[PDB]
């Protein structure tokens, strides 16, 4: 149960005024980019999965 | 951890001005301060079924 952040530059701390507005954004699945490992192996062949 | 959402951001509004922008690390931790005395932990025990 986590909270990310938003770290784009320009949106990360912008005032918004009255309006209705869309905010798409897509997310990672890859477990070799979302997780980290200390001996560094591959975690696409050793099974590990997000969903 | 088991604290809310609700009731985190009263912690922070109240000892650090925080709140409706970016929470961060806050600069002045007094020593009878919530954030660095706050300690949230996560353990994993198994189902403990019939077998």
Partial sequence: HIQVPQKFFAIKN???LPGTYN???????????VLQSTLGNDL???????? | SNLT???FMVQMAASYNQGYQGFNWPNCTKHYGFINNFEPMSRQVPEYGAN
């Fill in chain 1, 23 to 33: 905010y798409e954004w897509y997310f990672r699945k890859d477990p070799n980019m």
């Fill in chain 2, 5 to 7: 959402k609700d009731f």
């Fill in chain 1, 14 to 16: 912008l005032l918004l």
């Fill in chain 1, 44 to 51: 696409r062949a050793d099974g590990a999965s997000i969903t």
